Ligand SMILES: O=C(Cn1nnc2ccccc21)N(Cc1ccsc1)c1ccc(-c2cccnc2)cc1
């Protein structure tokens with residue numbers, strides 16, 4: 216029993232973190248096989264960030280413009296190329312700790328583990344959702360760029376995020392491991408801001424199912440709803456519209472608890488209209504939206520506490 | 522910016538987890554140098570748990586009653602002894618991944634990282650406080666016994682918890698790495714229950730300081746309080762009494778923000794009396810008590826957002 220914001224064990228990723236220095240700029244990189252990935256803004260001075268032409272800044276560098284430090288060991292760079300907003304440095308040594316891995320572009324509402332790093336040294340691990348506005352509510356200080364996000368399935372690390380920037384509201388933006396930004400953001404100084412965000416409806420429903428698996432039913436009711444009647448309420452409370460795709464994903468949790476998805480939707484509509492009346496769900500006074508249906512099945516018992 | 526329940530990077534601990542089997546019972550152990558530590562209830566049958574005499578159950582075992590599996594590798598047990606509520610198995614192989622480590626007995630209110638494990642395989646990592654009632658609000662399923670809690674300081678792992686049991690309210694109890702229980706609990710079936718708990722006052726104050734470091738002052742006020750006038754309110758709201766020791770620990774956060782500790786106490790007294798008026802602090806609608814002053818200084822910027 217219990218229900219926590221749980222991260223994946225970080226060791227497979229810790230063995231990949233290095234420090235990348237270009238001039239007076241240092242940040243983190245990811246060392247897999249004989250390639251180091253890092254934000255391309257490593258090649259900028261403070262002033263360059265105001266209006267960088269990265270093609271023009273990079274052609275001015277050699278392989279020996281870059282220093283890679285893996286623990287105490289210096290790696291020699293033997294190649295470099297830009298891929299979207301990342302640099303790919305070829306190094307003289309294959310990482311002996313390279314795990315089985317993939318690169319994946321996650322979708323909004325999906326969750327991942329972040330390993331916060333500074334100077335190539337991991338400092339902390341925590342679980343993030345990709346917000347519908349393509350930001351994450353991370354915890355990052357200066358030096359954290361190149362920190363990575365990931366998921367683990369059966370000893371394969373799916374890398375999905377590399378940290379590039381903090382926006383003015385204190386939330387965080389970055390790229391996939393092909394260097395494509397999540398959301399409309401760019402790795403230069405502009406007036407860019409987080410767009411309006413929404414509550415991740417599917418995740419709120421998953422977490423209500425989690426609370427029923429763990430033995431709590433107080434918030435259920437004898438009502439049902441149509442998808443459209445639900446969505447009229449959802450729009451009032453700045454929730455994402457529920458789709459039939461979302462109903463189908465909740466099938467297994469529905470089956471484990473014997474609560475029809477639209478009957479759980481009716482329960483959520485009543486929670487949004489009435490509030491929680493000073494009550495808690497899995498210890499929370501608010502509706503949690505940073506657990507996916509997959510997270511709930513990973514963490515909760517396969518046997519409902521009936 | 523941002524503020525998250527952050528765990529320590531788990532890799533140094535992942536390289537220590539093994540599976541321990543005695544008969545039909547399997548759970549997790551911790552492999553450091555040539556010793557494996559695990560809960561002594563590994564030697565019990567289901568029926569033995571009702572009223573075990575561990576001295577009498579253990580004298581009936583040999584070294585070869587125990588199987589230790591480290592990944593695919595079988596370790597041979599060459600020695601065994603009981604230490605309080607743990608077994609110490611001597612094995613034929615020193616763990617090559619043993620980190621620099623200590624064993625520490627943490628105090629109530631202090632925080633640690635838990636690596637949830639099943640069958641010697643790490644599944645998740647999350648941060649826990651030791652509650653004043655000597656339980657933790659963990660997330661554990663059957664098979665999780667022998668999972669460990671820890672802190673990391675400069676590459677030294679301080680191991681402080683080994684998981685033994687879930688109590689009837691769904692919270693979790695266990696021992697230090699000398700096998701002494703936190704709290705009054707025992708590793709047998711009884712009517713034992715979590716005692717009454719309290720809010721960790723010191724941690725609530727640390728987290729208010731975190732919110733000011735990160736640039737939020739909405740909840741401050743022009744009042745001060747005496748320690749005793751604060752404690753009269755604290756007792757009404759099931760908060761731990763604040764002591765001068767607690768005031769002294771908050772000195773550095775006080776200095777970084779320029780808010781006197783008792784002026785922060787006045788702010789908390791007003792939050793407890795008035796509530797939060799639909800507002801949030803570091804994204805929370807409740808007063809958080811699972812971050813110590815040390816956690817706040819580890820995670821927050823050294824420069825207050827004035
Ligand atoms: O957001 C960042 C860096 N960053 N990331 N997470 C952070 C958390 C707290 C504080 C700063 C943090 N930016 C703006 C930016 C805008 C588009 S892409 C990056 C940032 C990148 C490089 C520099 C810099 C400084 C000196 C030399 N070279 C680069 C200067 C600024």
Ligand SMILES: O=C(Cn1nnc2ccccc21)N(Cc1ccsc1)c1ccc(-c2cccnc2)cc1
Nearest residue numbers: 216565566567661662663685686687707708709710
């Ligand atoms: O709490 C536990 C085990 N445990 N721990 N975390 C859990 C989370 C969810 C479910 C069960 C969990 N107990 C009770 C207990 C009371 C004092 S010490 C342990 C427990 C230990 C060994 C057994 C057992 C079963 C079969 C064979 N041998 C032992 C049977 C029960």
